[model samples]
Target: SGFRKMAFPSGKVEGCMVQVTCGTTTLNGLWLDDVVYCPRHVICTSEDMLNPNYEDLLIRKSNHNFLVQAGNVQLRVIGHSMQNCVLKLKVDTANPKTPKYKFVRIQPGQTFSVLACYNGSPSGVYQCAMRPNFTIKGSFLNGSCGSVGFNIDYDCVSFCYMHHMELPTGVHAGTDLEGNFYGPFVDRQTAQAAGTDTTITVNVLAWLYAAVINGDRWFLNRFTTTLNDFNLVAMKYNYEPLTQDHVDILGPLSAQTGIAVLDMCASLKELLQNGMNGRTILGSALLEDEFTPFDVVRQCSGVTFQ
Candidate 1:
């Protein structure tokens, strides 16, 4: 009835698979194929076509106006209530286009991925509104009715299909071994799988991009400072010359893992003073090496890594 994780096919090859489970019996399609479904839960065996750069931040609410450069932007929406719900993605108001907008109807026991990218349009802003189905009388539930939970997963890259939009100015894209372009950023799973065979420069591009696009200045600033220092270090070593691409790529990481990187640096600096035998060495001031995906951090009510 609730979220469960069990055994399921890898859904890719002949035999290479793992345990899987879902909320419903409805198997619309494969998650690897870019479209997957279940009643109210989701499970993707392999890496998503694109790692969701932003989700939990938007999940804290029901409506959002997000910025996107091109169509083919991947998105996942999970309905939290058993009541009928409809996810409405409104298009650019002034522009005339096919299907005035794209909408997905879902219930609590299921999940669906709606299109942020239009059929004909390339890039634009989308007004995402998650509302209860009007057909249901209790659509507008008060505090007592609990709440309608719709979690939106925004992708770092567009959908991997026949369509491919050119990358925006200053934004870079990576290609898989098959030569298909993915994100300017790569996930740990994809990065490890490809290893030396691929040239994807793994970093936190998606996190910072989401922060900037969503107008989260505090998050953006924190990560940016960390990168600025790293950039300076790069200049010192002459590993890679400073360029616009460096800033463009590394800047997003600032809003991405600034604390992690800076915290390590502080740890290193402190180590120079007090040896491993010192008191400060064992204190709680030193941040742990634990890693939490940015999307997961946003799902909570309060800020994390504080």
Candidate 2:
């Protein structure tokens, strides 16, 4: 009550050697792109009170049809047996209760082939189950003797990261003609020239250039100095140079402080939503004015231009 006695032709060439045979069955429907599998066995185990210890061994049928979705992916099958067997291909994704299946019938000793495009949805995992159904007494069995499974994984193409340049703007004065700026003074001569004037503006552009050239912002702020007295106790005030460290620290520190303030404001909003009320008093401010009372009466002035 098995497959009717049949002979598979030999010397057939597709994508692989077609002389392979599985028992007396010759594989039919041989193609260049089908996945092939020979007969094999799978062992199943069960552990229950009624069926405490049990084992089930299933044998793989000779020729099974392998079907995959249509896309750009590569697909291939090869087997030694079922040289003249016919393979049946079936696809079943309609029933929610069952997996999408492809069916095919192959003769023994022959290979079944499929060369279709992989047009199925690619982002997700797609499974292909291959089973060999054999005719027993002119009727097909409920399940194949052997089965195998595989998956197609899809991914997007690759790309590279890019870098960009940012121009300075806003209240923060940028570098001067020489690309220097008022920040930290790494040059000892510049630091000495800066003096003790707290309101004086140094060559900010030069300082900026120096900072970038040296690759170290910390070098700009390492300086100290003292100033001589200027007469006329009640005279008008004058500008003084900012301490090198002050100029050096303000730029980056102020940006960081601004971010912190924004975070604190966000937190305050959250607190307000949660029915909390409290005043958030920020700390003392640093002055950036050109003139202070000390420098005013001294008539000492300085400038930091390009």
Candidate 3:
């Protein structure tokens, strides 16, 4: 019903006949004629319109031949084959255009690897020729046989491990956004007794104090003495101060209780600057005179004014 042209590369002209058959039913009176050969053209003719209508047509062309130009070329494999057959790989990338041959014999229950020869040309487009003896077994064979398409690129791999640990409990024990640990002090005695114990050490106490202060949560046991209570008790000796050792013991304890002793002194100075009665701020001259006799008060009894 229609004309088609199948052209081959430049070569001598050869004539051939192609037969079209469909399932034991061979239509008669259909033939191809007037075969012509040219530098780049091959011609064939078909007759009988019903012959083209068959769903399956097998064309057998004979004496078809062509010559390949000499150049670098990539051969791509695009066919299936049966197991236990040797696959011939050919490349034309070298000078003089010699076809390099590699034999790939695939066996039953085995796998094979092929290194593609890249000749500095763009990949993917390729041509391949194989012997009919190693013909494909259609779709019957399994386990990684047949036409395979692939791409090549450089790659890398790396290994790593994850670490996790449970932290102490309390406000400081919970993990912070930065993955740092925070939690409450285990016990107040453990916190305060550190400074008193020779094994506990002051450096440890300072570290603990700094951590507690800088941590997200603020905490400590109740205060044993308020500044107002201490001041009133100190007045019994008329504000006569204790010795350095006496003050040192109380000062650490006071600082731990969150009492700002300097802040209290500043408050007293501000009251005096504001013209509050000095006697009221400091206590009467009689109280001061009586406390002057003692180097340090042994007991806190007479220190209270009221």
- Per-residue lDDT over 103-126 for candidate 3, one digit per residue giving the tens place of the 0 to 100 score: 223211111111111211111222
* Model 3 whole-model lDDT (C-alpha atoms): 0.21
TM-score of candidate 1 to 2 decimals:
0.19
TM-score of each candidate?
0.19, 0.13, 0.14
lDDT of 1 by residue, 10-117 (tens): 111111111112221111111222222111112212232245322332254331221111233333333222111111222232212111112223321121112221
Highest lDDT model number: 1
- lDDT ranking, best first: 1, 2, 3
In terms of TM-score, the best-performing candidate is: 1
Which regions of candidate 1 are displaced past 4 Å? 1-180, 183-228, 234-293, 299-306
Name the runs in model 2 displaced over 4 angstroms.
1-58, 72-76, 79-120, 123-306
CA lDDT scores, all candidates in order: 0.24, 0.22, 0.21
Ten-residue region with minimum lDDT total, candidate 2: 157-166
Tens-place lDDT per residue, model 2, 15-58, is: 21122123332221212223332221111121221121111211
Worst 10 residues of 1 by lDDT: 10-19
Residue runs of model 3 more than 4 Å from their true location after superposition: 1-258, 277-297, 301-306
All candidates: CA RMSD (Å): 20.3, 33.4, 39.9
lDDT, candidate 1, equals 0.24
